[PDB]
């Protein structure tokens, strides 16, 4: 990372400071990096964050630049295609049963976090165009 | 498939279906050829007569006994007596059901290699076996320890057995016989002024020694009473209704089996020979042969001859040990109804000489399975 | 590897048998890493190489068919089971053409007509397993092809066989449309008290045991209505009436007489106290808690009478069985080792001709001497005290079971009707395996029945699949077959156990433990299944089907023992005193074989019964010891799925290809792993694309014309992979959406 970029990166992590210490929560570092560009799994973000416990997790905090070789870590379509045709075969996806594998599978989100992506984006039907729906939400 | 139980001794034929309880043919064993020219024309004269026919037509007939002491005497006439036994008298062909055949302790093996032979060859028997008598009256018997005692027409014979093991050298042979005794029961019965020379009146005579012979419990206190009045006396009606009585003579007769100076036999009476036999044998097993001694074979059948042996092995036995004398009824039978058990068991039937084992080696083959 | 952190396997446990574990860590060639449900903290020792059973995915379990899940094992069946039962409350169950039953001690209302409507056209595909389906199955089976169809029950007898049978006569009649003409099923319930009282024992195990099969025809027409039925016995077991160990009783029948013995109705019978007999004492235990045997009298009483037994013959049955019970009251004295005698005016040989009316000197008499005859002469003998012993006993046996022949024919008599049997349908009722911890020569017959029974089921399923496969165009000689020939050949063949001990009667002094040297010198290392155990040279061990059974020599001669003086017999049916003592003999060779000869010959007439029919099978289970209705324990299930060969039925069908699917029903679910190339215009063609790049062992399926098989495990491996490749989907496309959320508070902060 440059002195550019990591100026706008500090300067994003401090957004993320709701203390005033010039730190973020080990459980903030996850939303830095995604609010950074990045796409990390929940494993990867605790692998980086070093498997920390709940305590530290939710009460300790770290600055910019402990968080900073952590975004490095971190940082170094065709699968999410087929990702996608996991769930097809006229091209769109039941609301219903979106919302169940996303709340019910894998990383199991709530619904409210599906709910506000998803708004907008189904039909009368209540069907998802889901290649439109990818490009929205990796833009 | 059932098999054959069938006994040949001098004197009566016994034969039967292994299973059951008792013969099914019981006949004496006869061949008679008649010695009259015949007169009649139509009469139906006949080659020869087997069995309980020459019996009947006896006065007519000379009749042979092709058997004498244990050994086969002439071939052909057994070969009649076993063809008239199994197809008229069974009516069974001995193709159709194994066989099983008895014979002495002591034989010339050329016989049973004999008898083997004209089993498979000249009657196409499935499969046979030669079992020794003493054997089958202990399994007749109900046990697997005693000393036997059998003697039918022709021999007697001892053998000791402990938990179904033989003792071949304690094996003893004597000729005493119902036929010996109904040949001494003549001559004597000459001295009494009665006399009876063909070959069929030796059967009225033996008759007589079935009817009225006895045993003396003690022999010179009945002779000397015997002389001292007629109470013994008794009388008896030859077949053209004569009347015959006989004396102190009758008990004399059974005596010489306990006597054989009588006969001028050199062997001593049936006491020695039997404890001579236990005496043979090992000590500890002595102790187990005196408490169990039995009797088969009609020579036996003489009314007290088994007290009479209580009385005079417990003399010449040790003293203090218990002796004991067992006398079945059936004891006639006994070495048949051995037979019956011994044919049904299942274990024998690995131990039948199946035909092709005959065809690989000969009649040389009875002396390896069989004895 | 199929072992994997998040797979699941069941693991050993004595609190009940089969305990559910999650596995933590995957697993490389000493040591598993595990959670149970409770402590979720374990170690696991793979022990040599053991692997614990893996458990299958819940879509499979529950599902109405074992055979349909992929892992088939003990846990497994045990499981889904248990959670048919209690999640359900579904009772019946498949396994193959078996049909599996559990009862409750609850009452259902799933019989009810309407479902036999319901049932009635269906094949048994379409629907759940219930009883009703294969009474249905077998009428169909009769009216399609002109043959005889028979329907096959077990299990210890508490599993209430019985009520199986009810509910199969009771769908006959109905769907026969024929309850205006038939009584059929009111005489068959009205004649259960009868045989319930002269057929069962208390066993040490169990009360109410029934230790006869009994198999009931069900006559049709040329037009398929109820004629009528047709009753037939097999297998009764004689020798409990002389001889028990201890705990048991003798045939209920007894102590149902004693019991009401102080009636003026039996005051002729001068009955005593249930335990002053020889045949009843021995048992040590005349009274089964909770039965009041006069309440059980009366019910037997009124089912003879429902039956049409007059009041004259029912006292001629009571009187004989009296007779039986004074008889077991003799006693003698040797006198010599070769004869016994009777004591002077012995009391009980006195009752005992008084209630015969044969006289005391008669049978004094000829109870104590036999009779040979030869052509020429009979002899008469006497016998030991021993054999008198043994011949009295067999005269009470061959009573016993010529009366229990007399009023299954009475009944028959009753149930019997006119019109020509077309063809019928028979219903079969039969114990299993029986093993205890003291095993004994009613043990051993009852085993040897069983071994003949699963020979021709055996037989009968792999003539199924052998069919089954060329109707679907495969290679049958793929198929193996597993012939348990070689134990009943162990058995009943010529120098087996059975005629080693049938000689051992005979032969002189024959004896209870040197027949044992006889097994052990003819079978000990030149058989297969046969075995010494190690601590005793008493006992031996046969390998039988299901599992190890070992007997003990200890009974097995005085109980095998049978033999029957003639006239000992001619005595009694000389009497004039009372009509039914003549009557029972009325109808040569039969009074010398043994008890084990006369087994074997009844086994044969009902092989050859059966043989000459299609079956169809039913099996009974006991859920608890207790009767709590709706509760299984999983310790007393799995004996009772051995005892049934259920579970050594499922593991011959483990051994190749239990499992199915049609190329739509495959191919619809797996579609989720199928790339846009690989999917065809053909189901067929795409599917063995699939299949051949997914599985690339082609030994474990095979194509066939609509279904694909596969060797046990390979579904279960299909939906690891799936479960597998749509979690990683899953979980790509949710850190995804998590990130969009994130990149929105971040707008949030920015803006
Ligand atoms: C002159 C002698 C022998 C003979 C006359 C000589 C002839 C040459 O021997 C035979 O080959 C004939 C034959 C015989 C018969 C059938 C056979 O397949 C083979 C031989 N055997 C006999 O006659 C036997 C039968 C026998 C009596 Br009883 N119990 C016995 C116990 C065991 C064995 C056999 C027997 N027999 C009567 C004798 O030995 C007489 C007692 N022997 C003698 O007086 C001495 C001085 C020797
Ligand atoms: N009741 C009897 N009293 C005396 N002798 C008898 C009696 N019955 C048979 N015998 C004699 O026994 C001999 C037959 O004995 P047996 O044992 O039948 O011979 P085998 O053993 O060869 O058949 C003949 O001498 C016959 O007369
Ligand atoms: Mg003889």
Not at chain 3, 554 to 579: A, R
């Amino acid at each position: 990372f440059n002195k550019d970029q990591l100026e706008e990166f500090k300067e994003a992590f401090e957004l993320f400071d709701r203390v005033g210490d010039g730190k973020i929560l080990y459980s903030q570092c996850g939303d830095v990096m995604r609010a950074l560009g990045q796409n990390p799994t929940n494993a990867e973000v605790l692998k980086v964050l070093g498997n920390p416990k709940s305590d530290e997790l939710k009460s300790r905090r770290v600055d910019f630049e402990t968080f900073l070789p952590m975004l490095q870590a971190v940082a170094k379509y065709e699968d999410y295609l087929e990702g996608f045709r996991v769930f097809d075969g006229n091209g769109k996806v039941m609301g219903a049963e979106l919302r169940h594998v996303l709340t019910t599978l894998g990383e199991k989100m709530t619904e409210e976090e599906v709910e506000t992506v998803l708004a907008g984006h189904e039909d009368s039907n209540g069907c998802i165009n889901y290649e439109a729906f990818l490009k929205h939400i990796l833009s | 498939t059932t098999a054959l139980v069938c006994d040949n001794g001098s004197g009566l034929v016994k034969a039967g279906f292994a299973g059951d309880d008792a013969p099914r043919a019981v006949f004496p064993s006869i061949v008679g050829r008649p010695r009259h020219q015949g007169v009649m024309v139509g009469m139906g004269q006949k080659d020869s007569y087997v069995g309980d026919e020459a019996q009947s037509k006896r006065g007519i007939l000379t009749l042979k006994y092709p058997i004498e002491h244990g050994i086969i005497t002439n071939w052909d006439d057994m070969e009649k007596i076993w063809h008239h036994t199994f197809y008229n008298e069974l009516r069974v062909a001995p193709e159709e059901h194994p066989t099983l055949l008895t014979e002495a302790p002591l034989n010339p093996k050329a016989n049973r290699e004999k008898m083997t032979q004209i089993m498979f060859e000249t009657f196409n028997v499935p499969a046979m076996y030669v079992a020794i008598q003493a054997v089958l009256s202990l399994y007749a018997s109900g046990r697997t320890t005693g000393i036997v005692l059998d003697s039918g027409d022709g021999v007697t014979h001892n053998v000791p057995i402990y938990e179904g093991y033989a003792l071949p050298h304690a094996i003893m042979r004597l000729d005493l016989a119902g036929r010996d005794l109904t040949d001494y029961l003549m001559k004597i019965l000459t001295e009494r002024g009665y006399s009876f020379v063909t070959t069929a009146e030796r059967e009225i005579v033996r008759d007589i020694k079935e009817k009225l012979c006895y045993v003396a419990l003690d022999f010179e206190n009945e002779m000397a009473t015997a002389a001292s009045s007629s109470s013994l006396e008794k009388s008896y009606e030859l077949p053209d209704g004569q009347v015959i009585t006989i004396g102190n003579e009758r008990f004399r007769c059974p005596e010489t089996l306990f006597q054989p100076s009588f006969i001028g036999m050199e062997s001593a009476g049936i006491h020695e020979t039997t404890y001579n036999s236990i005496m043979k044998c090992d000590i500890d097993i002595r102790k187990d042969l005196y408490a169990n001694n039995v009797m088969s074979g009609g020579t036996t059948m003489y009314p007290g001859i088994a007290d009479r042996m209580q009385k005079e092995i417990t003399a010449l036995a040790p003293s203090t040990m218990k002796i004991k004398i067992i006398a079945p009824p059936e004891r006639k039978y006994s070495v048949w109804i051995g037979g019956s058990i011994l044919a049904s068991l299942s274990t024998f039937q690995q131990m039948w000489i199946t035909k092709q084992e005959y065809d690989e080696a000969g009649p040389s083959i009875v002396h390896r399975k069989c004895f | 590897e199929l072992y994997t952190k998040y797979a699941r396997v069941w693991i050993p446990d004595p609190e009940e048998v089969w305990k559910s574990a999650e596995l933590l860590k995957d697993y490389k060639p000493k040591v598993l890493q595990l959670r149970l449900e409770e402590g979720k903290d374990l170690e696991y020792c793979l022990d040599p190489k053991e692997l614990p059973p893996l458990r299958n995915p819940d879509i499979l379990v529950g599902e109405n068919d074992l055979t349909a899940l992929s892992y088939l094992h003990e846990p497994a069946v045990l499981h889904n089971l248990k959670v048919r039962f209690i999640d359900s409350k579904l009772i019946y169950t498949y396994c193959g053409i078996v049909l599996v039953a559990i009862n409750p001690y609850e009452q259902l209302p799933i019989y009810g007509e309407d479902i036999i409507n319901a049932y009635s056209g269906q094949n048994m595909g379409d629907m759940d397993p219930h009883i009703f389906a294969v009474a249905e199955e077998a009428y169909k089976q009769m009216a399609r092809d002109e043959r005889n169809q028979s329907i096959i029950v077990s299990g210890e007898s508490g599993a209430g066989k019985t009520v199986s049978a009810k509910y199969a006569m009771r769908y006959f009649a109905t769907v026969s449309g024929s309850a205006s003409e038939a009584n059929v099923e009111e005489k068959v319930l009205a004649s259960n008290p009868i045989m319930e009282s002269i057929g069962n024992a208390k066993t040490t195990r169990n009360d109410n045991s029934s230790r006869f099969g009994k198999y009931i025809e069900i006559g049709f027409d040329k037009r398929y209505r109820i004629i009528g039925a047709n009753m037939r016995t097999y297998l009764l077991e004689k020798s409990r009436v002389v001889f028990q160990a201890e705990e048991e009783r003798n045939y209920h029948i007894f102590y149902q007489l004693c019991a009401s013995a102080a009636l003026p109705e039996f005051k002729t019978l001068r009955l005593g106290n249930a335990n002053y007999f020889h045949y009843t004492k021995q048992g040590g235990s005349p009274v089964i808690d909770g039965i009041d045997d006069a309440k059980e009298m009366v019910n037997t009483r009124q089912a003879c009478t429902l039956l049409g037994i007059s009041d004259s013959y029912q006292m001629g049955i009571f009187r004989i069985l009296a007779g039986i019970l004074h008889l077991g009251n003799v006693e003698f004295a040797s006198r010599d080792s070769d004869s016994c005698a009777i004591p002077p005016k012995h009391d009980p040989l006195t009752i005992f001709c008084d209630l015969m009316g044969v006289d005391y000197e008669e049978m004094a008499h000829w109870l104590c001497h036999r009779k040979l005859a030869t052509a020429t002469e009979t002899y008469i003998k006497p016998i030991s005290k021993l054999h008198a012993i043994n011949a009295r006993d067999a005269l009470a046996k061959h009573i016993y079971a010529n009366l229990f022949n007399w009023i299954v024919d009475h009944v028959n008599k009753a149930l019997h009707s006119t019109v020509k049997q077309h063809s019928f349908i028979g219903v079969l009722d039969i114990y299993g395996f029986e093993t205890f911890e003291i095993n004994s020569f009613e043990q051993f017959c009852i085993n040897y029945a069983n071994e003949k029974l699963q020979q021709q089921f055996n037989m009968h399923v792999f003539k199924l699949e052998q069919e089954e496969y060329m109707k679907e165009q495969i290679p049958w000689t793929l198929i193996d077959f597993y012939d348990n020939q070689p134990c009943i050949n162990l058995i009943e063949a010529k120098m087996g156990v059975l005629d080693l001990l049938d000689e051992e009667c005979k032969m002189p002094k024959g004896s209870d433990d040197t027949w044992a040297q006889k097994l052990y010198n003819t079978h000990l290392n030149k058989c297969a299944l046969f075995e010494k155990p190690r601590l005793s040279n008493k006992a031996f061990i046969i390998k039988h089907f299901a599992d190890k059974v070992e007997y003990q020599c200890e009974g097995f001669l005085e109980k095998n023992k049978d033999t029957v003086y003639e006239e000992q017999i001619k005595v009694l049916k000389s009497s004039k005193k009372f009509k039914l003592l003549p009557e029972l003999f009325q109808d040569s060779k039969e009074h010398k074989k043994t008890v084990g000869h006369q087994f074997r010959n009844s086994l044969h007439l009902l092989m050859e019964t059966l043989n000459a029919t299609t079956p169809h099978y039913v099996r009974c289970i006991k859920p608890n010891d207790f009767k709590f209705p709706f509760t299984f324990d999983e310790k007393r299930a799995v004996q009772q799925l051995r005892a049934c060969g259920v579970l050594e039925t499922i593991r011959i069908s483990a051994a190749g290809f239990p499992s199915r699917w049609t190329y739509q029903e495959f191919f619809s679910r797996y579609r989720v792993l199928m790339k846009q190339k690989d999917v065809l215009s053909d189901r067929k063609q795409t599917c063995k694309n699939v299949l051949e790049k997914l599985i690339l062992d082609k030994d474990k399926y095979q194509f066939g014309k609509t279904k694909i098989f596969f060797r046990a495990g390979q579904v279960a491996y299909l939906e690891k992979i799936r479960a597998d490749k749509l979690r990683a989907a899953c979980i790509r496309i949710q850190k995804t959406i998590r990130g969009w959320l994130m990149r929105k508070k971040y707008m949030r902060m920015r803006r």
